[PDB]
Write a protein that binds this ligand. Structure first.
Ligand code: ASP
Length: 387
């Protein structure tokens, strides 16, 4: 439909960089880049990787907060077939050691010098602080470096997304370009982001919730705001129109909102996944923001997302997590008939390439993804947990 098959991640950027070069693409606490600027810095970073001899198919581990540079690192890596491995700042050191070793990167990018030092205890690989490596990036940007393309297959890995906690064996979903682009386009065919949206994203890009707000904004030409008591003010002052939520973040917002009758009237949508949104929270969001749709979704990192409740149906089938992503199938398992509880299984161009270097774990979950969640479809195709 508007669904993208066979796509490359960095092509999203190249398109918007040319289509709307002067529109605002990324804002963080420190400034704003237009799409041109984002394209230019991503190109520069690609030349920095070339300069360092990081090759197609290799990994970089990047442990950075939500700042513009991280998005440039992401796209610059994609443009060279290099695999982006985003990790959350604040991980415990033994946890980093485990994950870095598993990811097996060519180098590691840290948030600053203190952090670069802590990383150096836990790996022998080369470690660069973003401030220092960025001085080079800016030189390269100024010299116009990195503008050339290089061969990248839609089947090449773009990202590894670690889902394992610190008490678990390291485990990342292995994400090829095609699947990412497709999933972004399929999500967007339901949610309807567009070029005058301002997306307020409080989720780290180390989680696919944030990464896909980078991608969906880039896809549509929207503006992404990379973002505590101040939350309501941030929202209203950014002019935020779209906000991905998780239930704890929604409760906080409804608590905070009673203390501010100016609200944030620009908000038109909240999109919830990761956990079940309780009715009381939904009601409070609608009351504080009657202009906004509250949209239930369900997913796993293994295929990015599984179901979305169409926005226009937000008041119906209160127990459902919605319909399959467009271009994908859900079935319940031996195919069970409607109403019959079984394992939720998923088929489509969003199902990712398995877990990185873990044939054994991959084998049990994976061309059909077995989620280990249980539920049923009703007659219409809507998905429910349990019975
Ligand atoms: N990846 C899921 C959420 C999750 O796995 O926590 C989604 O974006 O719907």
């Amino acid at each position: 439909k508007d669904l993208r098959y066979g796509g490359l991640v960095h092509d999203l950027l190249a398109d918007s960089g040319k289509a709307t070069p002067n529109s605002d693409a990324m804002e963080d606490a420190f400034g704003t880049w237009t799409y041109q600027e984002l394209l230019n810095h991503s190109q520069a970073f690609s030349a920095w990787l070339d300069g360092k001899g990081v090759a197609r198919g290799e990994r970089i581990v990047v442990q950075l907060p939500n700042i513009r540079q991280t998005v440039a690192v992401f796209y610059g890596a994609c443009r060279r077939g290099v695999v982006f491995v985003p990790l959350n700042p604040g991980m415990k050191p033994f946890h980093l050691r485990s994950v870095i070793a598993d990811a097996d990167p060519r180098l590691v990018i840290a948030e600053d010098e203190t952090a670069a030092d802590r990383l150096r205890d836990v790996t022998d690989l080369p470690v660069y602080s973003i401030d220092s490596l960025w001085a080079d990036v800016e030189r390269l940007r100024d010299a116009g470096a990195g503008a050339e393309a290089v061969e990248v297959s839609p089947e090449d890995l773009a990202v590894l997304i670690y889902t394992s906690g610190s008490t678990a064996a390291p485990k990342a979903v292995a994400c090829p370009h095609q699947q990412i682009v497709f999933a972004a386009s399929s999500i967007n065919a339901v949610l309807g982001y567009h070029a005058e949206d301002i997306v307020f994203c409080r989720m780290s890009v180390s989680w696919d919730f944030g990464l896909y707000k980078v991608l969906i904004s880039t896809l549509t030409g929207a503006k992404l705001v990379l973002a505590d008591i101040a939350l309501v003010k941030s929202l209203r002052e950014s002019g935020a129109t779209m906000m991905p939520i998780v239930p704890s973040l929604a409760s906080m917002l409804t608590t905070l909102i009673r203390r501010d009758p100016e609200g944030a009237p620009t908000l038109r949508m909240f999109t919830n996944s990761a956990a079940a949104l309780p009715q009381v929270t939904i009601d409070a969001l609608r009351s504080a923001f009657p202009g906004a749709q509250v949209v239930r979704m369900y997913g796993q990192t293994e295929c990015k997302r599984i179901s979305i409740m169409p926005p226009h149906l937000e008041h119906e089938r209160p127990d459902s997590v919605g319909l399959p992503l467009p271009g994908t199938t859900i079935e319940i398992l031996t195919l069970l008939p409607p109403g019959e509880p079984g394992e939720i299984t998923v088929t489509g161009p969003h199902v990712m390439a398995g877990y990185w270097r873990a044939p054994e774990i991959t084998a049990r979950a994976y061309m059909r993804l077995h989620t280990g969640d249980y539920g049923h479809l009703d007659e219409d195709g809507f998905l429910y947990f349990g019975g």
